[PDB]
Amino acid sequence: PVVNTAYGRVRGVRRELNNEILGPVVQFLGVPYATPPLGARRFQPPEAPASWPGVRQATTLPPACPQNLHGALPAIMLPVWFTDNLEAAATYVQNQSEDCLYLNLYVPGKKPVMLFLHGGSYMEGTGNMFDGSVLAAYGNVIVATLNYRLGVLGFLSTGDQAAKGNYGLLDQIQALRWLSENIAHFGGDPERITIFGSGAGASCVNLLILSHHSEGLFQKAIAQSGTAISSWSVNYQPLKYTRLLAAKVGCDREDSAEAVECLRRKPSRELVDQDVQPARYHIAFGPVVDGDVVPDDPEILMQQGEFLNYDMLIGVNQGEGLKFVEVSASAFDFTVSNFVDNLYGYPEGKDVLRETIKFMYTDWADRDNGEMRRKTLLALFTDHQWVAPAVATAKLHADYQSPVYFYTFYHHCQAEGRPEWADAAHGDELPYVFGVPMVGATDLFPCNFSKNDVMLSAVVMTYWTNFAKTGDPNQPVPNRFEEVVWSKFNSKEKQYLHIGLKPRVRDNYRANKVAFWLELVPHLH
Amino acid sequence: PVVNTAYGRVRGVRRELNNEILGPVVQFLGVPYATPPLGARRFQPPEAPASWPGVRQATTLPPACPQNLHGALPAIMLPVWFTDNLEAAATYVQNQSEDCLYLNLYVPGKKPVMLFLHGGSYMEGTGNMFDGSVLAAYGNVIVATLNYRLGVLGFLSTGDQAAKGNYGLLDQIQALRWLSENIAHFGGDPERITIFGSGAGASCVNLLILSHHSEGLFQKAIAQSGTAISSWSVNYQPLKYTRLLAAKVGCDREDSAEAVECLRRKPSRELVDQDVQPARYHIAFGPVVDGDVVPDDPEILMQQGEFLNYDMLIGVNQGEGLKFVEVSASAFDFTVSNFVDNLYGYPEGKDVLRETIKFMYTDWADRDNGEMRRKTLLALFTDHQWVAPAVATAKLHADYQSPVYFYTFYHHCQAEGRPEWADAAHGDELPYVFGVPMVGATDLFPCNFSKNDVMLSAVVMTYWTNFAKTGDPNQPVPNRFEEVVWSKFNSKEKQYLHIGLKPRVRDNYRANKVAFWLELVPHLH
Amino acid sequence: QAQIVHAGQACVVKEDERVYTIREGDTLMLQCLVTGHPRPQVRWTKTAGSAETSVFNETLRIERIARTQGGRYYCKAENGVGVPAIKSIRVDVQYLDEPMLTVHQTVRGNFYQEKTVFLRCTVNSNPPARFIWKRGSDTLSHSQDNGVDIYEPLYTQGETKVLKLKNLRPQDYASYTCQVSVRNVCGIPDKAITFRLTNTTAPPALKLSVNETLVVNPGENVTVQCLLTGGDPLPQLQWSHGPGPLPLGALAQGGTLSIPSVQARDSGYYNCTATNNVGNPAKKTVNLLVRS
Amino acid sequence: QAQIVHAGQACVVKEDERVYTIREGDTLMLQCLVTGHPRPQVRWTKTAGSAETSVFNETLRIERIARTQGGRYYCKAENGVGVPAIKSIRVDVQYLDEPMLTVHQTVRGNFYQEKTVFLRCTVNSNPPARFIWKRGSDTLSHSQDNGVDIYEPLYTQGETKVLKLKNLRPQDYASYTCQVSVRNVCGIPDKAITFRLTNTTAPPALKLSVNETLVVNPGENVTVQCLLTGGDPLPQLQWSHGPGPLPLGALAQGGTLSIPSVQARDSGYYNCTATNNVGNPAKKTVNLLVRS
C-alpha cells in the first residue's frame, strides 16, 4: 500500500473494521503536509513540506499539537463527551511535539474528499480521535483528519504585522492545498472536496468559507454546531491576552516584534502550560481579524455578501449548553445578570435587557419550580450561542443564492449521567457522523447503542456523504425516513430538517427567540 | 297581576314567549325605585321614591335616560351589535326624560333575583333592550333591568364636595335597596340576589363589589367583558372634562358649587347634546374615585384586600376590540405608537416599550402579510383592555378566598359582516345570556341562528342561573358539555372554562401575554 | 337623618386625608360620631369577606396593632330614616424589620478571569424600603465606583436589592453595609446590616462522622457528629428529622446529635445543615435505620 | 517568491485602511503591483459566488460605478513558486438619494380629541443617513418643543424616520422639512424635502364617471373619466390595466382614459389611482367587459 506524492512515497496500512458489512480500508496516518514550524517558522505561515527519497512509513498516528488538559478546561464550550471522558481523551494526546503538522487519510472513479476540522476550543483536541474509516467504508468517500496548531502556537496575534495570527487556519489552508494537488494520487477527486467540523472546527469551516486563500481548494462545507459570529468564534482582543501571556513568561517588551522575538525562544512546554484566563464566553487565543485570511468582521462579510457560493449544511442540537446549567430564582437572576454584562459589554440599559430576557425565557404557565428554570436556561444559552447564529448564517448565505441545508439534531446517545430523556447536548452528533454505533462503543464514547442508534447513524452518514458528492444531502443514495425531502433553506421559507427518531421538515425553528436576539435585543442598547 | 309594595300597588302584564317549551311570564315595566332627580336632586344621590295610593299601571316600557346617539359614538368600547344596528337601538330610546329612574321585572319558594346592569360606555344604553323574560322562564329566576343616570347627568364630578359624582352607581345601589325590601312581595329572595352586566355594566359590577354601600344588598356578581381596572373603567380627570363641558354651556365659574349651580338650571337636552371629547381609550364622564362609594383606586382596593367575598364569575370573549382594527407595517407602527402614548401617559422610554410591544405581538413565522398583522392587533387590544384586567381581577379576588369562575367565550353569532369564522367580538355573548336564539332573531340581533346557537344559549343560561342560585355555575341543573366540571379559579392553577362549540377546562389563558402586560410592562417606565 | 363623621385624634403618628397612619404596636383609637333625629346604631366594621367581628361602640380602640390588623375599616349608622351612613378609613400600619444580607458568588473551574460577587439585601416593611449600599463609610453607586452595579430584581416584589461586584479588585475586599430606610414615616429609624468580604470568604462544607445510611439495633445509643470542612464566616449547624420529631434526641451543640435509645419510630432521615450567609447551605444526611 | 501590493491613487475621495471609498459615478482605478523571480500572473477578481468576470491587467478601472459594483475585490499573483499572493479591498461606493416625505393621519368618528399626525421621511443611501427635522427654519426635537416626538422605527432597516405631532396645536400647522445628510463623506451635500400641513390637508378621493363594471360591445369607443372629490395637495392620477397592456388605450390627462376600439383582449380591470403623499392612495376600478 505504497503511494507516491509530489514530495515523497508513503507506506500505509490496511485494516478491517469491526463490522461484518463494512469491508477493509487503507489508512495513511501521519503524512506531512507542511514544513515543521519549529524555529523561525513558529508564529509564521505554513510552507510546503520537505521531500523524502525513500518510503516514509506512515502506519502510526502522528503526535498531537502541544496542549494542556491539566486544569482549567473550557467545559462550557467543549463537547460534552470530551469533558466527561477526559482520560479516554488524554490517551490520544500523550505524544505532543510542536512538529505536529501531519494528517491522516482513510480510503476505501475519482472518490470525493471529506476533511474533518476538529474543534473544541482552539487550544486542545486532535484529529486522531476520529477514526474516519467507518465513515469512509460506508460513504464511498475518503476521510481526512489533520492536526493544526493550537492555542498560543496557533493563534497568537498582536493586531500588528509582527504576528498577524490565524496560523492554525493557515495550516488548514495548507492541508487543503496539499490535498488539492496530492489526493489524485490516492484516486480521490480534488474537485469534490468537502470540509466538515463540529464546534470550534465548524467555526473554522465558516471562516474558510469567508476566506480568500481557500478559493480553489474546496467546494462544499458543513458546519455542525459551530458558527463564525458567536462570542467565542473570533478573538477581538489579541494584543491584550498576548501581552498577558508575554508578561507571564518574562516576555513583556513594548515592541511587538521583540516580544514575538523572545516568545520564539521559549520552549513550547512552558508556553502551553500557561493559562491566560479570557473573558466569560470569550477566548484568549483564537482566530482574529487579520485583514488577510479573514478580510474583515465575519458578520460584516456575510451582510455585505463578500464571499463565494459554497454549499453549506448548517445545523444545531436541541440542548447544547448542557454544561452551562450544571435552579433558584435568585440564581436565575444572577446568571442572567452575568450573561448580559459579559455578552453585551456591560451596557447602559442592562436592567431593561436583563428583565426582558428573564421574561422571554420564563414559561409563565408554571413559574414556581426550578426544573423549568433549568430548561429555560438551557434554552437560553442554546438559543443565543448556537441556534440564533446558525439561523443568521444560513439566512445571510442563502440570501445570496448559496444552497444551504439546515438540520436540528434531537435524538442523542445514552450514556452514564446522560439519560435518553435529556436533550442532545453539544457534540453528541459526532458519534452518528463517524459511524460509531456500527463498530461498537469506544472508550471515548461509552454509549448504550441500540438498533435505533445504528440506523440513525447510517441515515446521517448517508446525508453527509450525499452532500459531499452532489451538494444535495438526499440525492445519490436514499427505517423512519420515508420520502422525507430535505428541502432547501431560504429567508422566505426557512425550512429545516428535524433529524431524530421521528423526522419531519418544519418551516421556522424557534422563530420568536431567533427574531428576539437578532432583531430586538440590538436596539436595547 | 297587581302586587302591593312598600310604596304603592303596581299592575303588571302577563305575556307568552315565542317558544313552545317556555311558558308565560309576568312583566312589571316601569316601577319607580327612586324619586325623580329633576331639580335640586339633579347631581344628587337618589332617595326613596314616592307613594301612590291607587294602582300604577306599569305595563309599558319606561323612558330611557337622556342620551345622544347622533354623532360621535365610542365605537371602540361599544358592543359590536350596538354599533352595527344603531337604528334598532335608537328605537329603544325615542322616549328620553331626566325622570328615568325606573326598573322592569320579569317573573315566571323564594326565587333568586338577577339584576342586569347594562353597559356600553356610561353615556348611552337602556335596560329596555334586554327582554329578560326568556332568561326568566328558562332559569327559574327573576330578571330585572333598570335605567341609571347616564353621562353628564349621572357621573359629572368636580373632585370636590360640590359634585362627588358616581350618581348612576348610586342609582344602581338604590335599586338594589329597593329590590332588597320589595322583591319579597313578588315571591323573590332578597338573600339570593345576583347582579350581572356586560362591558361598562360589568365595570359597574366590579365597582359595586368594591363599594361599602352594597354591603347587604347582593351576594353574587358576574362580570362579562368588563373590569374596574381598565383604562376606560374609571374617570381620573373629572374636573377637567366637567370644566370643558361647563365652558361649552356658558357655565365656567371658578367656584365648583356655582358651576354646579348653573348646571342644574340648564335643560338636560342642551347638556346631553354637548360632546366633550375625552382622551383616547378614556372617558370624560364616568365613575370616579369619590372616596365614598368608591373608597380608593379599585386596583389599590383589590391589592390591599379591601372588599367582601362576593362570588365572582368573570370572563372574556376571544376577539373583543374588533372595532379597534377596522394592516400595513407602517400603520402597525403608528397605532402601536398612539397605543403607548395614550395608555402609558407619553412615558420616557416609549421607544423601548413600543418596539418590545411590536415584537411581542408579531408572529415571526410569517412577518410579511397584513392579515396576520390584523390578527395581532386584535389580540393586542383584546389582551390589554379585557383579558389582562380580567385575569388580574380574578387572581386578586381569588387570592383572598373569593370563589371565582373564569370563562372564555369563543363561539359567536353569524350576522352580516360578521362571518362565523371570525372571532367572538365584544358583546356577542349577550344573545346567548338572554336566550335570544330560543325566541327568534330580533331586529337588534339579526343573527342566522342555528341549532348550535340555541343549545349553547341554553348551556350558558344554565351556567349563569345555576351561579345565581348556589354560587357554583354547574351544580343545580346539569350536547357537547359532557361531565365538564367548571373548576374553580385560584392564582395557583388559574383554571378557566372555554365556552364554545368544543368546550374544555384549561389552566392558563394567554399566560405569556398576561404576564407581559402585568409583570414586565410596568418596569418599562 | 343619619350622618356620621369620625375623628382620628388618637395616639397616632403625625405627617407633614382618609388614611390613618400609625406606627406598629402603638395604640389606635378612632372616634365615630353619629347624628340622627332617632338615635342611630353605630358600627365599626373591618372589611372582611362575607356573603359579629365588629365593635358596636362609638370608639374603635386597639392597643397593639400588628400588620395583620392593618386593613380597611368603616363606621356605619343604622337609622331607619333614609339610607344608612357609611364612612371608611384605610388603617396603614407601618414598620421596618431588620435587613438580611447574603453573599452569592454563583463557581466551577476558574477558567475565566471574572471573579464576580453578588450581595443581596432583603427586608420586610409596610412602606417599600429604600436601600443604601455602603463600603465602610462610603455610600457607593455605579457613577461613583463603576466597578459595581446596583439593581432591584423584578418578580421579587421589590423587597430586595442586589449590589454586584463584577470583577473583584483589591479594594473590593472590604466591609459592605446595607442600610434600609422607611424615611422615618412613623419616626421609624433606618436599620443596617454588614458583611466582611475577604480573600477567604467561602460557603460552608460539612463532614459527617458516619456513613450515609446508618444501621442501628433497637435500644442502642446513637451519636452522630456534624463537622465543618469549609466556610470563612463561622457557619451555624442544626439537625432535623422531618415528619416526626424524636423526644429522646438532643442537640447539645449544633454538631452533636444524640439519640439515647432507638425504636423503629426513630428511623428515617436526619439532615444536618450549616448556614452562613455566603452561599448555598451545606446539607449532610444520616439515614438512620433500625432493624426489624 | 510572489508578493503583491496595490496602490489606490485614483480619482477617489479623500477622508481625514483597507477600504476604497469613492463617490458614486466617479472613476475608480486600483493598481496591483506584483513581485516575482518568475513573472507572476495578475488577477483582479470580484467576490462573486462560484464553486472570467475578472480583469487580468495590473489596473482595475471602472469609469462609472453604481451601487451594484460596490462589492469586495481582491488581486492575486499566480506564480508557481510557493503560495499565490492575495490582497483584498472593500470598494465602498457611497451616495445619497432624495428624501421622500409622507404624512399619515391614521381616522373615523372624531370621538376623541387627539388629532395626531405622523410625518415619515425615507431615504436610500450607502452611508446610513442622518435625519434632521425642521419646522420652517427651526430644527425641532422633543426637548425643544415637547408637542412632538421623533423616532426611527425598527424592522425598516433604519432608512426612515418618523416625526410625530401628538395633538395638533395652531403652531403645528406649518411647513416641515426633512433634511437628510451623509455628513459629506464624499463631498455629497445634504438634501431636503418639505410638506405644508394646513387645516385642509387630507388624502385623495376619486369619482368615477362610469359604474364599477362597464359593459361594452366590440369596436365601440370607450372613454372613462377619473374625477377628484378630495385631497388638499393636488393629487396626481394614473390609470392601469394589469397583466396585459393595451396599445389602443391612451391617457392624455391623468383623469381621462381612452380606448378607441375594443376587442375581447381589452377586457379586464382598469384601476385609476390618485396619490398625493398625505394618506392611502385612492383606487377606483373600471371592470371593462366585452360581450361574447
Ligand SMILES: *[C@@H]1O[C@H](CO)[C@@H](O[C@@H]2O[C@H](CO)[C@@H](O)[C@H](O)[C@H]2NC(C)=O)[C@H](O)[C@H]1NC(C)=O
Ligand atoms: C432530609 O433530606 C431528605 C433527602 O433524602 C429529604 O427527602 C426528600 O423529600 C422530598 C419530599 O417530597 C422527596 O421529593 C425526595 O425524593 C426526598 N429525597 C430522597 C427520598 O432522597 C427529606 O425531606 C429531608 N427532611 C427535611 C428537610 O426535614
Ligand SMILES: *[C@@H]1O[C@H](CO)[C@@H](O[C@@H]2O[C@H](CO)[C@@H](O)[C@H](O)[C@H]2NC(C)=O)[C@H](O)[C@H]1NC(C)=O
Ligand atoms: C386592479 O384591481 C383589482 C381589484 O379587483 C385587482 O385584482 C386583484 O388581484 C389580486 C392578485 O392576486 C387578487 O388576489 C384579488 O382577488 C383581485 N381582486 C379581485 C378579483 O377583486 C388587480 O390586480 C388590480 N390591477 C393592478 C393593480 O394592476
Ligand SMILES: *[C@@H]1O[C@H](CO)[C@@H](O)[C@H](O)[C@H]1NC(C)=O
Ligand atoms: C440499556 O440498559 C437498560 C437496562 O439495563 C435497558 O433497559 C435499555 O434498553 C438498554 N439500551 C439498549 C440495549 O440500547
Ligand SMILES: *[C@@H]1O[C@H](CO)[C@@H](O)[C@H](O)[C@H]1NC(C)=O
Ligand atoms: C345561513 O345561510 C347559509 C346559506 O344561505 C347556510 O349555508 C347556513 O347553514 C345558514 N346558517 C344556519 C341556517 O344556521
Ligand SMILES: *[C@@H]1O[C@H](CO)[C@@H](O)[C@H](O)[C@H]1NC(C)=O
Ligand atoms: C489574600 O488571601 C490569601 C489566602 O487566600 C493570602 O495568602 C493573601 O496574603 C491575602 N492577601 C492579603 C492579605 O493582602
Ligand SMILES: *[C@@H]1O[C@H](CO)[C@@H](O)[C@H](O)[C@H]1NC(C)=O
Ligand atoms: C446512652 O447514653 C445515655 C446518656 O449518654 C446513658 O444515660 C445511657 O445509659 C446510654 N445507654 C446505654 C449505655 O445503653
Ligand SMILES: *[C@@H]1O[C@H](CO)[C@@H](O)[C@H](O)[C@H]1NC(C)=O
Ligand atoms: C382652518 O381651516 C378652516 C377650514 O377647514 C377655516 O375655516 C379656518 O379659518 C382655518 N383657520 C385659520 C385660517 O386660521
Ligand SMILES: *[C@@H]1O[C@H](CO)[C@@H](O)[C@H](O)[C@H]1NC(C)=O
Ligand atoms: C373613436 O375615437 C377616435 C378618436 O377619438 C376616432 O378616430 C374614431 O373614429 C372613433 N370611433 C368611432 C367613431 O367609431
